[PDB]
Structure formats: structure tokens, C-alpha cells
Amino acid sequence: VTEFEEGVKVFMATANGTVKKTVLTEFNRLRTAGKVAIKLVDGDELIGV
DNA sequence: ATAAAATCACCCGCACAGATTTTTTAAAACGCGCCACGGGATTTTTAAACCGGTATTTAACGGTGTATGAATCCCGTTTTATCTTCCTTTCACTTTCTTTCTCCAGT
């Protein structure tokens, strides 16, 4: 990400064909330990953002 | 008794780096609820396989001239095995305090 601006969204696609959309401004500032962004189930992993 | 050589505590102001100590904030959680979404049972439509044929497009092959992979030699990096140590602990000993038992001079 070059910079955070406007109200663009983030598209997340995992295995088994599950999609999810979230606003970028949520990830504007993060601490040393990050926050939960997706509730994965069983053996599922993010493949594309 | 004359010579050679050493060591430490505190007071007064001021500026700053580092170590606790509250205080605020964002993430995680719980309870309740409702409607968005996916399952199941019909209609509908279209993606790809199949017959042709033609017209290109690729890969295998035969010469030259390099760039690099394995081997060797080192030196900083991190692990692991290996020493010494100060507080916890009791404990037999020693010391020190408290009560008691006589002596004993005086009348």
C-alpha cells in the first residue's frame, strides 16, 4: 500500500471460495500486535488481497 | 621511631536521562434479535464437442562464445557445554539476660 486515503475498500478472497469486503480506513493505524481481520474456519487460508 | 605509597562520607543549584505510576483508549466479549442467504424443486438457454478442411507457428538440430557452479580458504556469529556464586536454611555453640539461693552483718 502506497498510502491510506479516501474510502476505498479491501477485497479478501480465501480458499474454498469465500469472499469478504472491508473498508481500508480500519487498517489505517496498527499497534505492535495486530487485530483480527477475518474469521477463518478449519483449514482455510487467504490467497488473494 | 623514621621512611615509601595510598583511601572515603556530607552540604549547596541546576539541568537532564532513566524508572515507576496513573489515566485514557481501542480491542475482545456477551446477550438478544431479525432478515439475508442458501437449500430444494421446476423452466430455460448456451458452451463446448464434433465433423470437415486450410494456413500458419513451434520445436528439434547444427555452430560459437561466454557467465556460473562447485570447490577451497578463510573470519565474524550463535549454541552449547561447563565453571563459580549468594541467598535460604538449620543447627550446635556461645553469649547474655532474668530469677533464685544462700551468706551474712547488724540489732
UniProtKB/Swiss-Prot annotation:
Localisation: Cytoplasm
SS bonds (residue pairs): none
Transmembrane segments: none
Family stated for the protein in its record: Belongs to the type II topoisomerase GyrA/ParC subunit family.
Free-text note regarding domains: An N-terminal fragment (residues 1-523) can be reconstituted with GyrB, but the complex no longer has negative supercoiling or ATP-independent DNA relaxation activities, although it is capable of DNA cleavage; ATP-dependent relaxation is inhibited by novobiocin and non-hydrolyzable ATP analogs. The fragment has ATP-dependent DNA relaxation and 30-fold improved decatenation activities, unlike holoenzyme it preferentially binds supercoiled DNA. The C-terminal domain (CTD, approximately residues 535-841) contains 6 tandemly repeated subdomains known as blades, each of which is composed of a 4-stranded antiparallel beta-sheet. The blades form a circular-shaped beta-pinwheel fold arranged in a spiral around a screw axis, to which DNA probably binds, inducing strong positive superhelicity (about 0.8 links/protein).
Function recorded in the entry: A type II topoisomerase that negatively supercoils closed circular double-stranded (ds) DNA in an ATP-dependent manner to maintain chromosomes in an underwound state. This makes better substrates for topoisomerase IV (ParC and ParE) which is the main enzyme that unlinks newly replicated chromosomes in E.coli. Gyrase catalyzes the interconversion of other topological isomers of dsDNA rings, including catenanes. Relaxes negatively supercoiled DNA in an ATP-independent manner.
Misc. comment: When the enzyme transiently cleaves DNA a phosphotyrosine bond is formed between GyrA and DNA. In the presence of quinolones this intermediate can be trapped and is used as an indicator of drug toxicity. The enzyme-DNA intermediate is also the target of a number of topoisomerase poisons, including toxin CcdB.
Binding partners and assembly: Heterotetramer, composed of two GyrA and two GyrB chains. In the heterotetramer, GyrA contains the active site tyrosine that forms a transient covalent intermediate with the DNA, while GyrB binds cofactors and catalyzes ATP hydrolysis. Can form a 2:2 complex with toxin CcdB in which GyrA is inactive; rejuvenation of GyrA(2)CcdB(2) is effected by CcdA.
Designated name of the protein: DNA gyrase subunit A
Protein source organism: Escherichia coli (strain K12)
Shown chain mapped onto the complete sequence: 637 to 685 of 875
